Design a protein around this motif. Structure first.
Motif, mmCIF file in Angstrom:
data_model
loop_
_atom_site.group_PDB
_atom_site.id
_atom_site.type_symbol
_atom_site.label_atom_id
_atom_site.label_comp_id
_atom_site.label_asym_id
_atom_site.label_seq_id
_atom_site.Cartn_x
_atom_site.Cartn_y
_atom_site.Cartn_z
ATOM 1 N N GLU A 48 0.823 -1.208 0.000
ATOM 2 C CA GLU A 48 0.000 0.000 0.000
ATOM 3 C C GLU A 48 0.861 1.264 0.000
ATOM 4 O O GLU A 48 0.421 2.314 -0.484
ATOM 5 C CB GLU A 48 -0.962 -0.013 1.193
ATOM 6 C CG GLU A 48 -2.225 0.850 1.008
ATOM 7 C CD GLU A 48 -3.152 0.408 -0.147
ATOM 8 O OE1 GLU A 48 -2.992 -0.704 -0.715
ATOM 9 O OE2 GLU A 48 -4.059 1.197 -0.483
ATOM 10 N N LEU A 49 2.087 1.178 0.523
ATOM 11 C CA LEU A 49 3.000 2.317 0.525
ATOM 12 C C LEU A 49 3.498 2.606 -0.879
ATOM 13 O O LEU A 49 3.305 3.704 -1.413
ATOM 14 C CB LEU A 49 4.173 2.032 1.461
ATOM 15 C CG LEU A 49 5.403 2.936 1.426
ATOM 16 C CD1 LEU A 49 5.087 4.320 1.915
ATOM 17 C CD2 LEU A 49 6.508 2.320 2.257
ATOM 18 N N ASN A 50 4.149 1.615 -1.492
ATOM 19 C CA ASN A 50 4.465 1.655 -2.911
ATOM 20 C C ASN A 50 3.252 2.033 -3.746
ATOM 21 O O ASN A 50 3.405 2.470 -4.893
ATOM 22 C CB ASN A 50 5.014 0.290 -3.334
ATOM 23 C CG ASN A 50 5.254 0.185 -4.823
ATOM 24 O OD1 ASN A 50 6.041 0.948 -5.378
ATOM 25 N ND2 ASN A 50 4.592 -0.775 -5.478
ATOM 26 N N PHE A 51 2.048 1.896 -3.189
ATOM 27 C CA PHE A 51 0.846 2.305 -3.905
ATOM 28 C C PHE A 51 0.586 3.806 -3.765
ATOM 29 O O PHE A 51 0.438 4.510 -4.770
ATOM 30 C CB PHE A 51 -0.354 1.494 -3.413
ATOM 31 C CG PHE A 51 -1.636 1.848 -4.093
ATOM 32 C CD1 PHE A 51 -1.784 1.656 -5.455
ATOM 33 C CD2 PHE A 51 -2.692 2.384 -3.372
ATOM 34 C CE1 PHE A 51 -2.962 1.993 -6.086
ATOM 35 C CE2 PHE A 51 -3.871 2.723 -3.994
ATOM 36 C CZ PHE A 51 -4.006 2.521 -5.351
ATOM 37 N N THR A 196 12.663 8.414 -0.253
ATOM 38 C CA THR A 196 13.564 9.098 -1.159
ATOM 39 C C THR A 196 12.872 9.353 -2.493
ATOM 40 O O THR A 196 11.810 8.796 -2.782
ATOM 41 C CB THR A 196 14.831 8.271 -1.367
ATOM 42 O OG1 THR A 196 14.525 7.086 -2.125
ATOM 43 C CG2 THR A 196 15.423 7.897 -0.019
ATOM 44 N N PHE A 197 13.502 10.196 -3.325
ATOM 45 C CA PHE A 197 13.013 10.420 -4.684
ATOM 46 C C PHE A 197 12.832 9.111 -5.470
ATOM 47 O O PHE A 197 12.132 9.106 -6.494
ATOM 48 C CB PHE A 197 13.971 11.349 -5.459
ATOM 49 C CG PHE A 197 14.021 12.776 -4.954
ATOM 50 C CD1 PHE A 197 13.077 13.261 -4.071
ATOM 51 C CD2 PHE A 197 15.023 13.632 -5.390
ATOM 52 C CE1 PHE A 197 13.143 14.570 -3.611
ATOM 53 C CE2 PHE A 197 15.087 14.929 -4.950
ATOM 54 C CZ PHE A 197 14.147 15.401 -4.055
ATOM 55 N N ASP A 198 13.454 8.008 -5.019
ATOM 56 C CA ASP A 198 13.365 6.708 -5.678
ATOM 57 C C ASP A 198 12.193 5.867 -5.176
ATOM 58 O O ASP A 198 11.753 4.943 -5.878
ATOM 59 C CB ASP A 198 14.682 5.944 -5.486
ATOM 60 C CG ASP A 198 14.790 4.724 -6.381
ATOM 61 O OD1 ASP A 198 14.179 3.684 -6.056
ATOM 62 O OD2 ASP A 198 15.481 4.809 -7.419
ATOM 63 N N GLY A 199 11.655 6.190 -4.003
ATOM 64 C CA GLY A 199 10.594 5.420 -3.386
ATOM 65 C C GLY A 199 11.014 4.663 -2.147
ATOM 66 O O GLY A 199 10.224 3.856 -1.635
ATOM 67 N N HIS A 345 -0.310 13.980 -1.285
ATOM 68 C CA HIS A 345 0.439 15.051 -1.902
ATOM 69 C C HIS A 345 1.899 15.001 -1.492
ATOM 70 O O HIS A 345 2.231 14.878 -0.307
ATOM 71 C CB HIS A 345 -0.188 16.384 -1.549
ATOM 72 C CG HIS A 345 -1.613 16.458 -1.961
ATOM 73 N ND1 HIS A 345 -1.998 16.861 -3.221
ATOM 74 C CD2 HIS A 345 -2.745 16.104 -1.312
ATOM 75 C CE1 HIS A 345 -3.314 16.789 -3.318
ATOM 76 N NE2 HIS A 345 -3.791 16.336 -2.170
ATOM 77 N N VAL A 346 2.756 15.089 -2.493
ATOM 78 C CA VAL A 346 4.189 15.149 -2.292
ATOM 79 C C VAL A 346 4.547 16.519 -1.761
ATOM 80 O O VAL A 346 4.175 17.537 -2.356
ATOM 81 C CB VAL A 346 4.923 14.867 -3.607
ATOM 82 C CG1 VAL A 346 4.092 15.365 -4.769
ATOM 83 C CG2 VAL A 346 6.300 15.534 -3.598
ATOM 84 N N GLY A 368 14.219 13.873 0.122
ATOM 85 C CA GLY A 368 13.075 13.008 0.083
ATOM 86 C C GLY A 368 11.786 13.793 0.087
ATOM 87 O O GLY A 368 11.770 15.000 -0.167
ATOM 88 N N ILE A 369 10.684 13.108 0.370
ATOM 89 C CA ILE A 369 9.366 13.714 0.331
ATOM 90 C C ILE A 369 8.549 13.158 1.486
ATOM 91 O O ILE A 369 8.848 12.095 2.039
ATOM 92 C CB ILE A 369 8.638 13.457 -1.014
ATOM 93 C CG1 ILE A 369 8.111 12.034 -1.079
ATOM 94 C CG2 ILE A 369 9.552 13.696 -2.216
ATOM 95 C CD1 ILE A 369 7.254 11.819 -2.279
ATOM 96 N N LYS A 370 7.513 13.915 1.854
ATOM 97 C CA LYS A 370 6.455 13.462 2.756
ATOM 98 C C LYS A 370 5.144 13.516 1.986
ATOM 99 O O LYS A 370 4.675 14.601 1.618
ATOM 100 C CB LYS A 370 6.389 14.305 4.034
ATOM 101 C CG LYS A 370 6.922 13.575 5.283
ATOM 102 C CD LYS A 370 7.634 14.509 6.276
ATOM 103 C CE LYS A 370 6.646 15.375 7.059
ATOM 104 N NZ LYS A 370 7.326 16.320 7.999
ATOM 105 N N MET A 371 4.584 12.345 1.705
ATOM 106 C CA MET A 371 3.238 12.294 1.169
ATOM 107 C C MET A 371 2.256 12.704 2.252
ATOM 108 O O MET A 371 2.350 12.248 3.394
ATOM 109 C CB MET A 371 2.924 10.890 0.670
ATOM 110 C CG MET A 371 3.828 10.455 -0.439
ATOM 111 S SD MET A 371 3.776 8.687 -0.739
ATOM 112 C CE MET A 371 4.355 8.016 0.815
#
Length: 476
Positions: A48-51, A196-199, A345-346, A368-371
């Motif tokens: 679900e995260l990778n989702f 990270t920007f890669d996931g 949202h990123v 990196g990002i926080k969704m």
């Protein structure tokens, strides 16, 4: 009980999810540090995260028109009368609840205790949690005597791991600000890992995933994860005023706001204020693709926020102040038929991380990002969206930064409220005095318990015709 953990199964899963990297400190750490990280990894769901991450990546504009007059309302004591009245009539019947968004929006507060406990420096030495509770006690009394039997507005408080413990302990040792704890309902949203920007999920140190709550728009799974819309169904709560923990001026359960959203027949409504300057950090409400909802100024293209209207006002003058009206029917709709559709949202962040040898380096360019899920996304799905333009100086002053130097700070949270009540005292028959009489930071400190007044009302009995020397403090 002990502490059981299958690490073969862990690496397996992680190899599949492709996140084996989260285990490279594992044989560099001790048994307590090791039990912690397991439960935490075990907690997560990487498919679900990778989702949501995919959902995030896939989230990247002339279809905008401003909001008309039609869905926008804005002092005519012939209809404000109605809204204040019809709103008030709902409070007295117990079909109004509040919902506090106290989860961890932004960091730049005293990185220890929750926002709502912050002491802006009021003469009352009060925290925001307090002012919020006393506001509800005052909105209760005003509707009970206006209608002749006691009532309640329950207080759903949404928290996260980062805030639940402390706030509950603050409520505890503070005797629940005199509120019957049956009608104050703390609960908890999920947290999401920074990636990270890669996931790839980030370790904020040897044993910890860089966690942070999943957006205040994570409200909806919290209500889903805690039978909340039933608890509201089981009290009769039919309208819920959602609001952000940081506003020192919040009209908790604003009768004008409810009364308005009802005469409008709207399933879902929001408060707005004139955007101050074009770059101001407030999401703007307007129709994209013909449907009225909110875009956060950061998603708003820069050079468009400068477009002005035919009179010269800002074309997109309508910033949302995180103050919404939701019918418990609309809540059900989105929990049981729309949360899948909420974009995470990123937000591209500098996530302090723990390197490949372990330095715990922080930044050197965002990494990196926080969704997050935003609560106002749910507007897209509205069946009849309303919106109230409200006076900034009267009910919108956010506490975001810890530095009194900055705007949106204890200094401005303070002054805003102190200024407000000063104007109430003026409009209510009271003149002020210098150190040498006379009349006219505000000219005079004055704070007024929400207990005593909520919008400025009922002050004549106390203040009218009397003169006062600063400061004037009003409580019982």
């Amino acid at each position: 009980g002990p502490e059981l953990m299958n690490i073969n199964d862990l690496k397996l899963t992680l190899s599949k999810a492709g996140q084996e990297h989260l285990l490279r400190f594992w044989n560099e750490l001790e048994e307590a540090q090791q039990v912690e990280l397991y439960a935490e990894l075990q907690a997560m769901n990487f498919e679900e995260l990778n989702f949501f991450f995919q959902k995030a990546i896939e989230g990247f504009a002339a279809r905008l028109r401003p909001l008309p007059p039609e869905r926008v309302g804005r002092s005519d004591p012939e209809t404000r009368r109605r809204w204040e009245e019809e709103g008030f009539r709902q409070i007295s019947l117990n079909k109004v609840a509040v919902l506090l968004l106290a989860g961890g929006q932004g960091t730049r507060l005293g990185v220890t205790y929750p926002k709502g406990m912050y002491r802006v420096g009021l003469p009352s030495r009060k925290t925001l949690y307090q002012l919020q509770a006393e506001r509800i006690r005052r909105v209760e009394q005003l509707a009970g005597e206006r209608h002749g039997t006691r009532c309640t507005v329950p207080w759903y408080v949404m928290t996260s791991e980062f805030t639940l413990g402390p706030t509950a302990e603050f409520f505890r040792e503070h005797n629940f600000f005199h509120l019957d704890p049956a009608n104050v309902v703390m609960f908890e949203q999920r947290l999401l890992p920074a990636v990270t920007f890669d996931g790839k999920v980030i370790l904020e140190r040897k044993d910890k995933v860089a966690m942070a709550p999943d957006g205040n728009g994570g409200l909806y799974c919290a209500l889903e994860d805690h039978k909340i819309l039933e608890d509201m169904e089981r009290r009769g709560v039919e309208f819920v005023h959602v609001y952000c923990v940081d506003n020192i001026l919040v009209r908790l359960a604003d009768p004008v706001f409810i009364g308005f959203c009802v005469l409008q027949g709207a399933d879902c409504g929001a408060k707005v204020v004139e955007k101050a300057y074009p770059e101001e950090p407030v999401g703007v409400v307007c129709q994209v693709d013909g449907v009225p909802q909110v875009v956060e100024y950061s998603e708003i293209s820069p050079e468009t926020a400068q477009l002005r209207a035919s009179d010269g006002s800002l074309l997109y003058n309508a910033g949302n102040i995180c103050n919404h009206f939701f019918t418990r029917g609309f809540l059900k709709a989105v929990t049981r038929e729309f949360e899948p559709l909420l974009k995470p949202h990123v937000a591209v962040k500098k996530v302090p991380y723990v390197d490949e040898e372990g330095n715990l380096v922080k930044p050197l360019k965002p990494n990196g990002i926080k969704m997050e899920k935003f609560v106002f996304d749910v507007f897209r799905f509205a069946k009849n969206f309303a919106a109230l333009e409200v006076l900034r100086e009267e009910e919108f002053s956010p506490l975001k930064n810890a530095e009194p130097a900055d705007r949106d700070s204890p200094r401005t949270a303070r002054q805003a409220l102190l200024t407000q009540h000063y104007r109430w005292a003026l409009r209510a028959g009271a003149r002020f005095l210098d150190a040498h009489g006379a009349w006219l930071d505000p000219p005079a400190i004055c704070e007024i318990s929400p207990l005593v007044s909520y919008s400025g009302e009922g002050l004549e009995v106390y203040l009218q015709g009397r003169e006062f020397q600063s400061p004037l403090i009003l409580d019982e």
